[PDB]
Design a binder for this molecule. Sequence first.
Ligand SMILES: O=C1Cc2cc(Nc3nc(Cl)ncc3F)ccc2N1
Ligand SMILES: O=C1Cc2cc(Nc3nc(Cl)ncc3F)ccc2N1
Ligand SMILES: [Cl-]
Ligand SMILES: [Cl-]
Lengths: 4, 4, 124, 124
Amino acid sequence: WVIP
Amino acid sequence: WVIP
Amino acid sequence: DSCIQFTRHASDVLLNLNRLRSRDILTDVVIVVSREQFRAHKTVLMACSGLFYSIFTDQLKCNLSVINLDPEINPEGFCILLDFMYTSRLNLREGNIMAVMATAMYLQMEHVVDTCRKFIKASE
Amino acid sequence: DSCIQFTRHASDVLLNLNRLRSRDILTDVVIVVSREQFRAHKTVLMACSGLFYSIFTDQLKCNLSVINLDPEINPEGFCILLDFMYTSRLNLREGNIMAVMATAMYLQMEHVVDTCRKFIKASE
Ligand SMILES: O=C1Cc2cc(Nc3nc(Cl)ncc3F)ccc2N1
Ligand SMILES: O=C1Cc2cc(Nc3nc(Cl)ncc3F)ccc2N1
Ligand SMILES: [Cl-]
Ligand SMILES: [Cl-]
């Protein structure tokens, strides 16, 4: 999961 | 395009 | 093999599948979550959810145009997960995390269940 | 928004859509390319090809279970492009590049047309  |  | 690969292809396919959903193009099922209705593509639901994979591989249920979910399922939680299926983006907030996690456990979306557990653990 | 994003989601969705195709699950169209038949999902074809997008958004054609392509289309070229749609990998070879490029121009797959033009230019 990432900060888009 | 890339070499997978 | 000796194939070449287009890096952005999968993301571009998903973006177009979400544009078809927005425009109600070739949607073939309605998911009912109490008083709310959500239109979607059976194939996208099956590709994202272990519950929908089991439903639409069943010889009788594969033919249904309407699926009613358990009344304990929160429509907002379902809406957030449906958006995730079509976009890869999860709108996870302090006010919805419990409903989102409960819905993801029901739909069998293991990667979502994993991130919810981690965010809950961080708060404790 | 304040969303989080699962990097591998789109690739995982496409992989599952290819597993449904392999297992002939919920395929809803047959594409006929001379003596050969290819089963696929209309939504994946529309998401990848400008020609299929135009076909399945047409009020009469959206209801067809069989689509016949132009007889000049090479079945091997089509097979390579169908595999690309479901996998992002293009099996481009000196012996098939002309058929693949001609099929991609017909199907309106601009990114494939672009890589074929570049590989052809490199050979000259
Ligand atoms: O957490 C999850 C997400 C998920 C999706 C699927 N989907 C499919 N699985 C296979 Cl093997 N082939 C085709 C499919 F559409 C099954 C189980 C699970 N569990
Ligand atoms: O080279 C290409 C690939 C391609 C795909 C599509 N697909 C769709 N386009 C839109 Cl705007 N919404 C939904 C779709 F399924 C249209 C044109 C083109 N041209
Ligand atoms: Cl997931
Ligand atoms: Cl393309």
